[PDB]
Design a protein around this ligand. Structure first.
Ligand SMILES: Nc1nc2c(ncn2[C@H]2C[C@H](O)[C@@H](COP(=O)(O)NP(=O)(O)OP(=O)(O)O)O2)c(=O)[nH]1
Ligand SMILES: [Mn+2]
Ligand SMILES: [Mn+2]
Ligand code: NA
Ligand code: NA
Length: 326
DNA sequence: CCGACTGCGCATCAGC
DNA sequence: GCTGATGCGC
DNA sequence: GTCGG
């Protein structure tokens, strides 16, 4: 929070360009610039000082000079007063509603939380549940609660089959004192890059977590990914725990390391590592790191036996999960 | 300058 | 139905 | 919006 005001400004501009302008590269530009300022260990005294950082160009430097001088940005002030921009920015805060749908809704007169509740028939499933838990999804999850949810998931998964390995990744694995949601990597010996010897491997886990009333809703569900809602059990007389977003990602057993690297994050850390890999002539996804041929086409999966192995190829000194919070 | 910008799963729709 | 594009989110 | 080529 050394430069909270600056990175908040850029995050806001990023949110604007994505939700309103629908210029995803501008969104990413501000995301990257915000991240690199966020870790810079000095209080920034000028735009030119920030201009020295990778990802901070002239337009952002000019804005940084304005913010430091006046305490705010005129461009953001205007965007805030704007009705259409403010409305779209709100609608996109509902999970399932993106820039397109939000703009599509405003065209109809649906631009408030009240408008959505009387028009739930105009939402698809994801959007209806996102609306349903709009409040709970705005709350953070204390790590103490995260440890609770970890015990349930890892134990319920043990009961379906003792060979399931479940690892809570995301910001939790990065050691965050509080998380926005729960991310769970899942591995079973039947599912590898070679064969799917067992069908319904992820379904049986979802099924079980529903049976004990942990998973309460589903946003989307497939053979390898689950997006849904979960809730901790409360004791007698206590007010219920808020409903929480939960992601579950089944990844082939022999590709656990590329999987856990991906799922641990952060989202920008992954953006920067995959960008660095390309320059080094490699491409990383959640499954494999692969070299690029002379034509650019990816080659065969290189051998990986640890997270650090992936860092080795692209010539990065290993960074533990808590040092990936970019 | 100016092309290129991380990589992909699930829902949904256009088109056949 | 399939296939590919798009929308949204991880 | 930024940057390497
Ligand atoms: N490569 C890549 N990975 C991503 C991206 N977005 C997310 N991931 C991967 C890396 C992310 O770390 C992981 C989980 O995504 P979240 O739950 O949405 N974010 P997190 O747990 O980091 O923070 P929070 O406490 O607020 O929930 O999925 C992306 O855009 N690109
Ligand atoms: Mn998360
Ligand atoms: Mn998540
Ligand atoms: Na710069
Ligand atoms: Na949204």
């Amino acid at each position: 929070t050394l430069n909270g005001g600056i990175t908040d400004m850029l995050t806001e501009l990023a949110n604007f360009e994505k939700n309103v302008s629908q210029a995803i590269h501008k969104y990413n530009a501000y995301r990257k610039a915000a991240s690199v300022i966020a870790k810079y260990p000095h209080k920034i005294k000028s735009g030119a000082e920030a201009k020295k950082l990778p990802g901070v160009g002239t337009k952002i430097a000019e804005k940084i000079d304005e913010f430091l001088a006046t305490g705010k940005l005129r461009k953001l002030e205007k965007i805030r007063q704007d009705d259409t921009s403010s409305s779209i920015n709100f609608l996109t805060r509902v999970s399932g509603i993106g820039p397109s749908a939000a703009r599509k809704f405003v065209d109809e007169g649906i631009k408030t939380l009240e408008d959505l509740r009387k028009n739930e028939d105009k939402l698809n499933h994801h959007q209806r549940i996102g609306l349903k838990y709009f409040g709970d999804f705005e709350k953070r999850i204390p790590r103490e609660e995260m440890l609770q949810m970890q015990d349930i998931v890892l134990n319920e998964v043990k009961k379906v089959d003792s060979e399931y390995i479940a690892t809570v990744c995301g910001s939790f694995r990065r050691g965050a004192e509080s998380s926005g949601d729960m991310d769970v990597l899942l591995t079973h010996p039947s599912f590898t890059s070679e064969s799917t010897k067992q069908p319904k491997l992820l379904h049986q886990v979802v099924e079980q977590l529903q049976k004990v009333h942990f998973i309460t809703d589903t946003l989307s569900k497939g053979e390898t990914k689950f997006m849904g809602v979960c809730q901790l059990p409360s004791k007698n007389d206590e007010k219920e725990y808020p409903h929480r977003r939960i992601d579950i990602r089944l990844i082939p057993k022999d590709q656990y390391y590329c999987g856990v690297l991906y799922f641990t994050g952060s989202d920008i850390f992954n953006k920067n590592m995959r960008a660095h890999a390309l320059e080094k002539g490699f491409t990383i996804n959640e499954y494999t790191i692969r070299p690029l041929g002379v034509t650019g086409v990816a080659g065969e999966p290189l051998p990986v036996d640890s997270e650090k192995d992936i860092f080795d190829y692209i010539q990065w000194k290993y960074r533990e999960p808590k040092d990936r919070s970019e």
